[PDB]
Every structure is written in structure tokens, then in C-alpha cells.
Scaffold this active site. Structure first.
Site, short mmCIF file in Angstrom:
data_model
loop_
_atom_site.label_atom_id
_atom_site.label_comp_id
_atom_site.label_asym_id
_atom_site.label_seq_id
_atom_site.Cartn_x
_atom_site.Cartn_y
_atom_site.Cartn_z
N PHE A 117 0.83 -1.20 0.00
CA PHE A 117 0.00 0.00 0.00
C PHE A 117 0.87 1.25 0.00
O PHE A 117 2.08 1.20 0.21
CB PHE A 117 -0.92 0.08 1.23
N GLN A 231 -5.71 15.22 2.20
CA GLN A 231 -5.42 14.19 1.21
C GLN A 231 -6.72 13.72 0.61
O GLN A 231 -7.68 13.57 1.31
CB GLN A 231 -4.66 13.05 1.87
CG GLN A 231 -5.06 11.66 1.45
CD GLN A 231 -3.98 10.62 1.66
OE1 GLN A 231 -3.88 10.01 2.71
NE2 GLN A 231 -3.18 10.40 0.64
N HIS A 233 -8.76 10.81 -1.46
CA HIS A 233 -8.67 9.41 -1.79
C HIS A 233 -8.96 9.36 -3.23
O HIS A 233 -9.89 9.97 -3.70
CB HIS A 233 -9.70 8.58 -1.05
CG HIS A 233 -9.45 7.11 -1.13
ND1 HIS A 233 -9.37 6.32 -0.01
CD2 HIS A 233 -9.29 6.29 -2.18
CE1 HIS A 233 -9.15 5.07 -0.37
NE2 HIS A 233 -9.10 5.02 -1.68
N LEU A 243 -15.81 4.97 0.19
CA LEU A 243 -14.42 4.64 -0.10
C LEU A 243 -14.28 3.22 -0.66
O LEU A 243 -14.85 2.27 -0.11
CB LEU A 243 -13.60 4.78 1.18
CG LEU A 243 -12.24 4.12 1.01
CD1 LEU A 243 -11.57 4.96 -0.02
CD2 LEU A 243 -11.42 4.08 2.26
N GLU A 246 -7.70 0.91 -1.37
CA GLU A 246 -6.67 0.85 -2.34
C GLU A 246 -6.65 -0.66 -2.60
O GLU A 246 -6.82 -1.14 -3.72
CB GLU A 246 -5.35 1.36 -1.75
N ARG A 288 -0.02 8.73 -4.13
CA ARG A 288 -1.39 9.02 -3.83
C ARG A 288 -1.82 10.25 -4.71
O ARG A 288 -2.40 10.08 -5.78
CB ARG A 288 -1.59 9.15 -2.29
N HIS A 352 -10.57 12.95 2.27
CA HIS A 352 -10.46 11.68 2.98
C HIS A 352 -9.88 11.79 4.39
O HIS A 352 -10.48 11.31 5.37
CB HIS A 352 -9.62 10.74 2.13
CG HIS A 352 -9.27 9.46 2.80
ND1 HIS A 352 -10.22 8.54 3.20
CD2 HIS A 352 -8.06 8.95 3.15
CE1 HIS A 352 -9.61 7.50 3.75
NE2 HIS A 352 -8.30 7.73 3.74
N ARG A 387 0.13 11.84 3.87
CA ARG A 387 0.17 10.58 4.62
C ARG A 387 0.42 9.34 3.81
O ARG A 387 -0.18 9.12 2.80
CB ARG A 387 -1.14 10.38 5.37
CG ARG A 387 -2.16 9.57 4.58
CD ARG A 387 -3.50 9.41 5.29
NE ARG A 387 -4.38 8.61 4.46
CZ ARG A 387 -4.86 7.43 4.81
NH1 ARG A 387 -4.56 6.92 5.98
NH2 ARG A 387 -5.64 6.76 3.99
C1 LIG Z 1 -12.65 7.39 7.04
C2 LIG Z 1 -11.58 6.36 6.65
C3 LIG Z 1 -10.33 6.43 7.23
C4 LIG Z 1 -9.35 5.50 6.90
C5 LIG Z 1 -9.64 4.47 6.00
C6 LIG Z 1 -10.90 4.40 5.43
C7 LIG Z 1 -11.88 5.34 5.73
C8 LIG Z 1 -13.22 5.22 5.07
N1 LIG Z 1 -8.71 3.50 5.66
C9 LIG Z 1 -7.53 3.57 6.20
C10 LIG Z 1 -6.57 2.56 5.84
O1 LIG Z 1 -6.80 1.65 5.05
N2 LIG Z 1 -5.34 2.69 6.45
C11 LIG Z 1 -5.00 3.67 7.35
O2 LIG Z 1 -3.86 3.69 7.81
N3 LIG Z 1 -5.92 4.63 7.69
C12 LIG Z 1 -7.12 4.58 7.13
N4 LIG Z 1 -8.06 5.54 7.46
C13 LIG Z 1 -7.70 6.58 8.44
C14 LIG Z 1 -7.83 6.11 9.88
O3 LIG Z 1 -8.80 5.06 9.96
C15 LIG Z 1 -8.31 7.25 10.76
O4 LIG Z 1 -7.55 8.39 10.37
C16 LIG Z 1 -8.12 6.88 12.23
O5 LIG Z 1 -8.64 5.56 12.35
C17 LIG Z 1 -8.80 7.81 13.22
O6 LIG Z 1 -9.08 7.08 14.43
P1 LIG Z 1 -8.94 7.76 15.85
O7 LIG Z 1 -8.47 6.88 17.02
O8 LIG Z 1 -8.01 8.92 15.76
O9 LIG Z 1 -10.38 8.24 16.24
P2 LIG Z 1 -11.72 8.06 15.42
O10 LIG Z 1 -11.92 6.58 15.19
O11 LIG Z 1 -11.67 8.87 14.17
O12 LIG Z 1 -12.90 8.30 16.50
C18 LIG Z 1 -13.09 9.58 17.14
C19 LIG Z 1 -13.46 9.36 18.58
O13 LIG Z 1 -13.67 10.64 19.24
C20 LIG Z 1 -14.98 10.67 19.78
N5 LIG Z 1 -15.48 12.04 19.74
C21 LIG Z 1 -15.64 12.86 18.65
N6 LIG Z 1 -16.12 14.05 18.94
C22 LIG Z 1 -16.31 14.00 20.32
C23 LIG Z 1 -16.79 14.94 21.24
N7 LIG Z 1 -17.22 16.17 20.93
N8 LIG Z 1 -16.84 14.57 22.54
C24 LIG Z 1 -16.43 13.35 22.88
N9 LIG Z 1 -15.95 12.39 22.10
C25 LIG Z 1 -15.91 12.77 20.82
C26 LIG Z 1 -15.77 9.69 18.91
O14 LIG Z 1 -16.99 9.29 19.55
C27 LIG Z 1 -14.74 8.55 18.79
O15 LIG Z 1 -14.64 7.83 20.02
#
Ligand SMILES: *Cc1cc2c(cc1C)nc1c(=O)[nH]c(=O)nc-1n2C[C@H](O)[C@H](O)[C@H](O)COP(=O)(O)OP(=O)(O)OC[C@H]1O[C@@H](n2cnc3c(N)ncnc32)[C@H](O)[C@@H]1O
Ligand code: SF4
Ligand code: F3S
Ligand code: FES
Lengths: 573, 119, 241, 130
Positions: A117, A231, A233, A243, A246, A288, A352, A387
């Protein structure tokens, strides 16, 4: 306000947050950790990751080839002391995930397979079919159930953090079912709240990825590093933005125009490879951005299908498609009506990932003592201007652990603070919530949402122009005025999502201005950030090998500063 | 909310019989209803195959007494299980419903055991 | 062109004002790509801003979506209006207390799932020693039972759960089963106490609707059943010693 | 005091009347009635068989009724439905790997039907050709 004491709070139960909670429970068995989230932890965006996660595994790989692939993939905007720590800890955390039961897809001999990837010469992406995020967010959420130290506050919407004399002291969240507020006191707080990809009209993200954790840090003088790098996608379903991994190309899949031409050789990722063997860095496995840019150029020549391109995988076969791209199959079948075995899949680039996020040192600490940021919400300086695909998920657990460990020490040497000051902050969040509830004006929040999406999409897109950027700075500042006339017509307290979405939007406007202003200022072309205007169409390591820091002052002016890139072994060239 | 130390139930006993019973009446019952319920009273059999002297000649042999006890008793422990649970399903409160149904099964089991050692 | 419209019936409820469920009707534009989740968003944008419902991912992997559509448990973001031109009727996910509109109290779900211990137990291997070795053969033992997105449709399927809200459930049983059958765990005895309970597998009558509505083809009815085998082996074991 | 109102929908003893899948599920447990009635019947014929050919002749007179031939035809209906459905649901109680793949249920449903065909043939042959 009801108060509960904690040794540390973690906001966000994504992969990042949850790993932080584990580590933090595993570093201090007597800790009382408060993990909070507005959605049950298994609904986190993490669950939608389909590609894989990166760590050096095969005998012919080297920490240096991942180091290099990340630095170069990032157009040298990467804190090379952070990227060094990263690749050196990826092996231990993928393994530790496997020790926790993550069902990594396997070689026949029992070892973990790996695929390729992000344009990484040596393949080093671990995976669980094409559901890898899903298997990774659950392994972590499920494994966390065993640490009584972890106390959850499911479906608590964290409103603001409490800061005083440059140290963080807790947070105010609303119990979304009860509609009551709650005070959580703790001497380290670990932001893990994701990117801000829903500030775009078309994105790959769920409805909750509205930026709230970044926007909170803006309000306390913390600065969003590098927010101009959004970035795109390359392969998303038209309209939905859905999505298509890849892993549709790492399995041999091809991208064609309206003439069936594999146009990507015409843009520096030639020559063409045979159907049979995809080769890394080439063709559909190119850089990318280039794979996205090339869509734009094709659309100029008129070579798009009325507007999409086509991702063909037919020549993959039933076994291979259903063993490593099951999800992709059904997703194509339901949202575009396409068997990836009979027909080709219409795709085009889609917003993305947010490279930028809360500024953090190499401990994921921000300028405020005790407040940390890890995960997509942060910018530990790992991805620079672009990224590396499959580096994100590794980040979550490599630095998630750090944050968890570092927050755990920090709170254990923190020392008390001014109680009257703190509670006066809490009382200050409460008042602000009331002011929002009583605000009137007859402006429809949803319509502001839709315009902010159209503006980011038009002014902060694949290619950028000072005139359109300016128009999106101008549109967004106009939107910042209109928000103050929004009336929250729902006044209930039990799960009032009318109020909450309005709150998420006011984070989006703030974070989006940072992106817009940051792009308009970066007079160069680097990574995702591409400029068509004269004197800004190429990288400028003389004048811009530096991070963009964006602040927001209390007068609502979005100010920029800049900082140096740590170089260690790989000097730009 | 949810218990910590629940009482291990006893359903793996009944479920065991109901399992054994459900599998016997799936392979064998169809031919048994055919023969006894349809052919026999319709005389649709060659000669004296299903005549009193032959049926008594079979029932009184060892393999017959075993099969006639299994043919009767195993489907009983399977049907009455299902009824017990059909009751709950239909929201029909039957007092000592475990005793009624399963006691009927043991009653009939003894009654048939009496029969295959002959009256 | 000109989009068609569909009369959608959605079941509303506000605990600060109603005494019970209060029905509604909304005209929603639609074409051949519009989901129920697309419809709920539209209604809240232009018809009734106070309408609440869980959601996020938009692509049938997150599992917050769950709710009844013409009395079938299904995920809204995989439900499309093209199939409901002769009537539609969204009701909050069945067998759960209704908290507000299309949101239900998932507490029992989460406690159940927490009560069977879904996490590797007893494997002393440490990260330095490299990963465990597990073939695709050992993995096919549990891989299908691992695809659960904790959405809850099967609890609304299951009539036993509706009759016995203390039943721990199909999902939860499938999950504990998913760890029993993983060659890396060694904690089957820590789970049997729940599975052998009357509120365990033995509250399941093999109605089979659970697996029929699973949007990820996990086949919970297959896990539980296999659990009654196991529960039984354990019965046998214990009783016989 | 909270501001909640956990509305609990009640479940009627007619829940199975709604959805067809539910109904087929009552029907499939409904086959429990004709199965014990037949086991009652056999106990009759058993004790008639013992009380001499006078009593056995009474029994065959009952089986001919012919309302009892309709009931025993319904019973032969029910026992088929059971076999059909019991064979579909049995294989789920097994977890079998055949070269890295969970198999079933088709290979198991196939064998069970093969055995009953063979049992039906061997039983019809032993009680009729002699
Ligand atoms: C969207 C996406 C991202 C992605 C991907 C495919 C898609 C459709 N494929 C990936 C891949 O193949 N390889 C890779 O390395 N990355 C890939 N990505 C990106 C990656 O998944 C994300 O960038 C990453 O997983 C983000 O995860 P993170 O631990 O940082 O947190 P989150 O899962 O995005 O969840 C957010 C949390 O915060 C809580 N939250 C949000 N707002 C609030 C407020 N106001 N108060 C309290 N809690 C809050 C959410 O509830 C959740 O717990
Ligand atoms: S088995 Fe299916 S219906 Fe049940 S919770 Fe899991 S994913 Fe949802
Ligand atoms: S609907 Fe119910 S009885 Fe068992 S097989 Fe499914 S949990
Ligand atoms: S949006 Fe993720 S399940 Fe419906």
C-alpha cells in the site's frame, strides 16, 4: 455540575483513544481512567478502515525503508525524529494486537501475511481481509473491557476543556441521554477525536468526524499544525463518497478513462504494468496525490465518463476478490449496482484524511501542560505534507500507547491547581451552552453545513488558486457570522441531536478556516497542497520547508505562525 | 444488572433427550406413519405382512421390543419438550409445567416400558 | 429532471411530552440511491429538526443504524426507499426500551456483551516472542463469527429476547463462542458460567430469525447451537465427575 | 430527577402472528402435536396387540375410521416438515474445517436425507416383503 475524579481523561474511543486507555491502565493499575465518547466505542470511524496497517515484517525489509518511504511520501514535512520512533515501534504494536486476538489474514504456515500500500517498495501492511479497521477497533475495544481502571462515559458529548495557568484540569461533557452536564477532573487529558473530513461536502468519513477535538484546542490557544494538507482518496463512489480501498489496486486492479486507457502512465507513473503483476510506485499504485491529480487532468482532456473514472478488477477472480475484498464487493453492489466480477466500478477522488491536527511534541503533549493529542486529531509530525497509506492506523496504536504512557506520568507529577479558577471555567462552559441555546435568528444550521462543504470543496480541493481560496476564506468568514443567527428550535434534553450537530458545525467552521487560511498562505506546491498560480507550482524548500501553525484569537481572527522541520539523516533533495 | 454467579441450568438433560428424540423421528417416523397409519388400515400391503400374527411375531422378538420402545418413547421426549417451550412462547402459564410435561413423558415412558416387557 | 416523492411513516416519541409513541408522516424526495438514512437526514434538515436517530459511517460497518422498517429489523443506511413505494414505517429497534424517537436504550446489549468476557485470556505470550501461530484452518473455526458490528438487529429479531429481557442474547453468545473457538485463547471455563445459565444458550429455541436479519451473515443461530453442544459437554463433564 | 421516559413496548402472546418467518417457526414447533399423538397411538396398538387378536382387530378398526386416516395423514405431513426443517438446523450445531474453510451445511443436509431414504427402503422392505 456533578463532578467525578479521575487520574486522566481520554476523549475519543477510536483506536488511538482506546489504546491510550489500555496503556494508561497498564502503566498504573490503580489509576481511575475516564474514557469518554459521544458514540459507543465500536461506532468510531476506525471501524471503516479497509486497507491495512504498516509495520516492517519480512526478512528483506528494514526500518530505514519504512523511514524513507514515510519521509519521502510526505514531501519532507515530517519531523524525522518522530518518524524514526514510529517505524521502530510498529512491529511491536501489530504483534501486540495479534497477541490480543486481532484475526490478521494469514500465510499458510500460520504467520501473518502482508500486502502492499501507499507506494512502499517493500510490502509491510498487515491485514484482516479488507475489514482491517473493523477488526482493529474491536480487538482494542473488546480487550479494554478487562481493565476496571477504564471507566467509560458512553454517549457523553465533551463540550470544552478546563485550563488554568497553562495546565489542563478536566472537561465538561453532556450526558447525551440525560441532557445534563458533568464535570470530569483529571491532570492529563488525551485528545483522540479524529480528523475533520466532514467539513467537505463529499468525504469518506462518517457523520461524527466533525473536528470537535481540534476546535477545542483552537479555543485554548493550541495551534493546528499543517491543516492545509487534505489528502484526497483517489477512488470514491460518486455522490456517496463511499471509499473503495486501495487494496483494490494492491490486488492488481486498474484505473481507466472513457477510452479504456490506463491514463496513469501519461503522468509520470509509467510504464504500464501487465494485468497480472502490479508493481509498487507505478501506475494505479502510484503516489497518492498524482493518482488524484491525474483524474483532474483527464477531466480537462474530456476523458472522464459522464463525472467518473473506472476501477477495473474483473481480472482478479472470484477466490481472490471474495477472500481479500469481500467488503468492496458488496459496497459496489449496493451503492453503485456493480459486481466487481462482472463490471467496472465508477470512482473519483474524495476528501479523505486531514494531515493536520493539534500540534504536539514527540510525546504527543501540546503547549498546554498535561493536554496531549494522538491520532488523526493530532499532528505529532509523522505524515508531513502527505500521509503514507496504511501509516495512519499504525499511528493510532504506536502513539496511542505513548500518549497513554505519557499522560500517565504527567498526571502523577502534576500537582494541584486553583479550585475557584477551575470551577469558574466549568461555570464558563455552562454559560456558553446556555447562550447558544437562547441564541435566535431563524438561520438553519443544516444550510450552513451544506455551504461550508461546498466552499471547502471548491476552494480547498485537489488543485488550488488564490482566487478560489480567497473566495472560500470569504465564504467561511461569511458563514462564521451567520452561525450566530442560528436558532436551535429543539429544546428537549433526552438525546437532543439538534443541539449537538449545531455544536459540531461550529467546530467545523473554525477548523475549516484554519485549512483555508493555511492553504492561501502556503505559496508553494507540496504534497496534497498543489497551487496552479505562477511562482507556486513547485516545492520551495528555501522558503517553505516549515510547518504551518494556525491559531485562533478570541476576536475570531485566524492567525498563522511557522516552525522548523527536524531533519536527522534524510536531508531534503 | 446482570448476574455474576448464575445457576447452571438443567436444560442440557432435556435438550439431550429432545435432541436424540428429534433425530429419531426425523429418519424413522415418516416410514412409521406410512406403514401403521396408512398402509395397515388400508390393506395396501402384500399378503399377511401387517396381519395380527406377524405383528405379534415381530413385537415379541428382541429387536422388536427395543425398536417399539424407541419408536414410542424418543419422540415423546421430543414432542413434550417442544410443547413445554411452546407454552412460554404463547405466553401461557402452566403451573409446574416442567413437572406436567416431563412427568407425562416419564409416566408414558414407564407405561411403554411395561408394554415392551409385555402385558 | 423531477424526483418522485415517498410518504414515509416514522414513529416519534419525546419523553418530556408524550405519554407514548406519536406517529408522523413526511414527504421525502428520492431516487434509486436514496437510503432510509438519506431520508432521515433530509427530514431533519427541512421537515422536523427535532428528529433524533443514531448513525455515522454510512456504509453498513458501524452498527449504530438499527431500526425497524415495516416490522423487519434492518439498518437504515442499507435500506433504500425504492423498495417501499407502497408504504414504509420506521419504528425504533424492537425489544428495546425507547428513549427518544429512533434511539433505544442499548444498556442491556452492552452489559451482556461485557458479561461473557470477549478478550484473550490465559496466553502468556509476550510481544517480544513474535506473534502466535494460527493457520487459516484454525482461523476458519471462528472467522465467520467475528464479523459482528454490534448493531442489535438480532435482538429485535429474537422473540425469546422479547419474552425474556434477561436472555444474554444471540450476539453476546456468538462473541463468547468466537473466543472459545480461537486457538490462542485459554479461557473457556471463565465463560461457561454465563452460557450454562437459564439466561444462557438454554433460553434459545432455535427460532432462527436472528441469522436471517444479520447484515453481516455471522449466523448467530449457529454459534449458540454449537454452544448448547458445548454447554452440554460441560454438563456431561461436570455431572459425570 | 431525570427527564427520561424509557417507554417499554409490550409483547403479546400473538407476536408470532405478524411476520411469516415467525409463523413458519410456530408451525415447525407445531409438528410437536402430531408426533406425540402418534406415540400415543402406538402405545394403544401395543397394548391392543398384547390383549389378543380380538383387541388388535378393534385397533385396526380405529385406524380405518377414516377421520383417523385424515389425522394420521396430517401426522405424516407434520413428520415430513419436521424432517425437512430438523435437517436444515442440525448442521449449525457443528463447526467443521475442510482445508481452511468452515463447511456445511449442504454436505450434512445431503447425507441425512440419504440415510432416511435408505432407512425408509430397508424398513418398507422388511415389513412387507416377508
Ligand atoms: C474514514 C476512513 C479512514 C481511513 C480508511 C478508510 C476510511 C473510510 N482507511 C484507512 C486505511 O486503510 N489505512 C489507514 O492507515 N488509515 C485509514 N483511514 C484513516 C484512519 O482510519 C483514521 O484516520 C483513524 O482511524 C482515526 O481514528 P482515531 O483513534 O483517531 O479516532 P476516530 O476513530 O476517528 O474516532 C473519534 C473518537 O472521538 C470521539 N469524539 C468525537 N467528537 C467527540 C466529542 N465532541 N466529545 C467526545 N468524544 C468525541 C468519537 O466518539 C470517537 O470515540
Ligand atoms: S450477529 Fe449480526 S445482528 Fe447480531 S449484533 Fe452481530 S452483526 Fe448485528
Ligand atoms: S432468534 Fe432466538 S431462540 Fe436463538 S437462534 Fe436466534 S437467539
Ligand atoms: S452508518 Fe454505520 S451502521 Fe448504518
Amino acid at each position: 455540575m456533578q463532578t467525578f475524579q479521575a487520574d486522566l481523561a481520554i476523549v475519543g474511543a477510536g483506536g488511538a483513544g482506546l489504546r491510550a486507555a489500555i496503556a494508561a491502565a497498564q502503566a498504573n493499575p490503580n489509576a481511575k481512567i475516564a474514557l469518554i465518547s459521544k458514540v459507543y466505542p465500536m461506532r468510531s470511524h476506525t471501524v471503516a478502515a479497509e486497507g491495512g496497517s504498516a509495520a516492517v515484517a519480512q526478512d528483506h525489509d528494514s526500518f530505514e525503508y519504512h523511514f524513507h518511504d514515510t519521509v519521502a511520501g510526505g514531501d519532507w514535512l515530517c519531523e524525522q525524529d518522530v518518524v524514526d520512533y514510529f517505524v521502530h515501534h510498529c512491529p511491536t504494536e501489530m504483534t501486540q494486537l495479534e497477541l490480543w486476538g486481532c484475526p490478521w489474514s494469514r500465510r499458510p504456515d500460520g504467520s501473518v501475511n502482508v500486502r502492499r500500500f501507499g507506494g512502499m517498495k517493500i510490502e509491510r501492511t498487515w491485514f484482516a481481509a479488507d475489514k482491517t479497521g473493523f477488526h482493529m477497533l474491536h480487538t482494542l475495544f473488546q480487550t479494554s473491557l478487562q481493565f476496571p481502571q477504564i471507566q467509560r462515559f458512553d454517549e457523553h458529548f465533551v463540550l470544552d476543556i478546563l485550563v488554568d495557568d497553562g495546565h489542563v484540569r478536566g472537561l465538561v461533557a453532556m450526558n447525551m441521554m440525560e441532557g445534563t452536564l458533568v464535570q470530569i477532573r483529571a491532570n492529563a487529558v488525551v485528545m483522540a477525536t479524529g480528523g475533520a473530513g466532514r467539513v467537505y461536502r463529499y468525504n469518506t468519513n462518517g457523520g461524527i468526524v466533525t473536528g470537535d477535538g481540534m476546535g477545542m484546542a483552537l479555543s485554548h490557544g493550541v495551534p493546528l499544525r499543517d491543516m492545509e494538507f487534505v489528502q484526497y482518496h483517489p477512488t470514491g463512489l460518486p455522490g456517496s463518497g463511499i471509499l473503495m480501498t486501495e487494496g483494490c489496486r494492491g490486488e492488481g486492479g486498474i484505473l481507466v478513462n472513457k477510452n479504456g486507457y490506463r491514463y496513469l502512465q501519461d503522468y509520470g507513473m509509467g510504464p504500464e504494468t501487465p494485468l497480472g503483476e502490479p508493481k509498487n510506485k507505478y501506475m494505479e499504485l502510484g503516489p497518492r496525490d498524482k493518482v488524484s491529480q491525474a483524474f483532474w487532468h483527464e477531466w480537462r482532456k474530456g476523458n472522464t465518463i459522464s463525472d467518473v473514472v473506472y476501477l477495473d478488477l474483473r481480472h482478479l477472480g472470484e477466490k481472490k476478490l471474495h477472500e481479500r475484498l469481500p467488503f468492496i464487493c458488496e459496497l459496489a453492489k449496493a451503492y453503485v449496482g456493480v459486481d466487481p466480477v462482472k463490471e467496472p466500478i465508477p470512482v473519483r477522488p474524495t476528501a479523505h484524511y486531514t494531515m493536520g491536527g493539534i500540534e504536539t511534541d514527540q510525546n504527543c503533549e501540546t503547549r498546554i501542560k498535561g493536554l496531549f493529542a494522538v491520532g488523526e486529531c493530532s499532528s505529532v509530525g509523522l505524515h508531513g505534507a502527505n500521509r503514507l497509506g496504511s501509516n495512519s492506523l499504525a499511528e493510532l496504536v504506536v502513539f496511542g500507547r505513548l500518549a497513554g504512557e505519557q499522560a500517565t506520568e504527567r498526571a502523577a507529577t502534576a500537582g494541584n491547581g486553583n479550585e475557584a479558577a477551575i470551577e469558574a471555567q466549568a461555570a464558563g462552559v455552562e454559560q456558553r451552552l446556555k447562550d447558544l441555546v437562547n441564541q435566535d435568528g431563524g438561520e438553519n444550521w443544516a444550510k450552513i453545513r451544506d455551504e461550508m462543504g461546498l466552499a471547502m470543496e471548491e476552494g480547498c480541493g485537489i488543485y488550488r488558486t488564490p482566487e478560489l481560496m480567497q473566495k472560500t476564506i470569504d465564504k467561511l468568514a461569511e458563514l462564521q457570522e451567520r452561525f450566530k443567527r442560528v436558532r436551535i428550535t429543539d429544546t428537549s434534553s433526552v438525546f437532543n441531536t439538534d443541539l449537538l450537530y449545531t455544536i459540531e458545525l461550529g467546530h467545523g467552521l473554525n477548523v475549516a478556516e484554519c485549512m483555508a487560511h493555511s492553504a492561501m498562505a502556503r505559496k508553494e506546491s507540496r504534497g496534497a497542497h498543489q497551487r496552479l498560480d505562477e511562482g507556486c507550482t513547485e516545492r520551495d524548500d528555501v522558503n517553505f520547508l516549515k510547518h504551518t501553525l494556525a491559531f485562533r484569537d478570541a476576536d475570531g481572527t485566524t492567525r498563522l505562525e511557522y516552525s522548523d522541520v527536524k531533519i536527522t539523516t534524510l536531508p531534503p533533495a | 444488572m446482570i448476574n455474576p454467579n448464575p445457576k447452571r441450568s438443567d436444560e442440557p438433560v432435556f435438550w439431550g433427550l429432545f435432541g436424540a428424540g428429534g433425530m429419531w423421528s426425523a429418519i424413522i417416523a415418516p416410514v412409521m406413519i406410512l406403514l401403521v397409519g396408512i398402509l395397515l388400515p388400508l390393506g395396501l400391503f402384500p399378503g399377511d405382512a401387517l396381519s395380527y400374527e406377524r405383528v405379534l411375531a415381530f413385537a415379541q422378538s428382541f429387536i422388536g421390543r427395543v425398536f417399539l420402545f424407541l419408536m414410542i418413547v424418543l419422540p415423546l421426549w421430543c414432542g413434550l419438550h417442544r410443547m413445554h417451550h411452546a407454552m412460554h412462547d404463547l405466553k401461557i402459564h402452566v403451573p409446574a409445567g416442567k413437572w406436567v410435561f416431563y412427568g407425562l413423558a416419564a409416566i408414558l415412558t414407564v407405561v411403554t416400558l411395561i408394554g415392551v416387557v409385555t402385558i | 429532471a423531477e424526483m418522485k416523492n415517498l410518504k414515509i411513516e416514522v414513529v416519534r416519541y419525546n419523553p418530556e411530552v408524550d405519554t407514548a409513541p406519536h406517529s408522523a408522516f413526511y414527504e421525502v424526495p428520492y431516487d434509486a440511491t436514496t437510503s432510509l438514512l438519506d431520508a432521515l437526514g433530509y427530514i431533519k434538515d427541512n421537515l422536523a429538526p427535532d428528529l433524533s436517530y443514531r448513525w455515522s459511517c454510512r456504509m453498513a460497518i458501524c452498527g449504530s443504524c438499527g431500526m425497524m422498517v415495516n416490522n423487519v429489523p434492518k439498518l437504515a443506511c442499507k435500506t433504500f426507499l425504492r423498495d417501499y413505494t407502497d408504504g414504509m414505517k420506521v419504528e425504533a429497534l424492537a425489544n428495546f426500551p425507547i428513549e427518544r424517537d429512533l434511539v433505544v436504550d442499548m444498556t442491556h446489549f452492552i452489559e451482556s456483551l461485557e458479561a461473557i468476557k470477549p478478550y484473550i485470556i490465559g496466553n502468556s505470550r509476550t510481544a517480544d516472542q513474535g506473534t502466535n501461530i494460527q493457520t487459516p484452518a484454525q482461523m476458519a473455526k471462528y472467522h465467520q463469527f467475528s464479523g459482528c458490528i454490534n448493531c442489535g438487529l438480532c435482538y429485535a429479531a429474537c422473540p425469546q429476547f422479547g419474552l425474556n429481557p434477561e436472555f444474554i442474547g444471540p450476539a453476546a453468545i456468538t462473541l463468547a463462542h468466537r473466543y472459545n473457538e480461537d486457538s490462542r485463547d485459554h479461557g473457556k471455563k471463565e465463560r461457561m458460567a454465563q452460557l450454562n445459565s437459564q439466561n444462557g444458550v438454554w433460553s434459545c429455541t432455535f427460532v432462527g430469525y436472528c441469522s436471517e436479519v444479520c447484515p453481516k451473515h455471522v449466523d448467530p443461530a449457529a454459534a449458540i447451537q454449537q454452544g448448547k453442544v458445548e454447554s452440554s459437554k460441560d454438563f456431561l463433564i461436570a455431572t459425570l465427575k | 430527577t431525570t427527564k427520561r421516559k424509557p417507554y417499554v413496548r409490550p409483547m403479546t402472546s400473538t407476536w408470532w402472528k405478524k411476520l411469516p418467518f415467525y409463523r413458519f417457526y410456530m408451525l415447525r414447533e407445531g409438528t410437536a402435536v402430531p408426533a406425540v399423538w402418534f406415540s400415543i397411538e402406538l402405545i394403544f396398538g401395543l397394548f391392543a396387540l398384547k390383549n389378543g387378536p380380538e383387541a388388535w382387530a378393534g385397533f385396526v378398526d380405529f385406524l380405518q375410521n377414516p377421520v383417523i386416516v385424515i389425522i394420521n395423514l396430517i401426522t405424516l405431513a407434520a413428520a415430513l416438515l419436521h424432517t425437512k426443517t430438523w435437517f436444515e438446523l442440525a448442521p449449525k450445531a457443528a463447526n467443521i474445517i475442510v482445508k481452511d474453510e468452515k463447511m456445511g451445511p449442504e454436505p450434512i443436509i445431503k447425507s441425512l436425507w440419504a440415510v432416511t431414504v435408505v432407512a425408509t427402503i430397508v424398513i418398507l422392505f422388511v415389513a412387507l416383503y416377508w
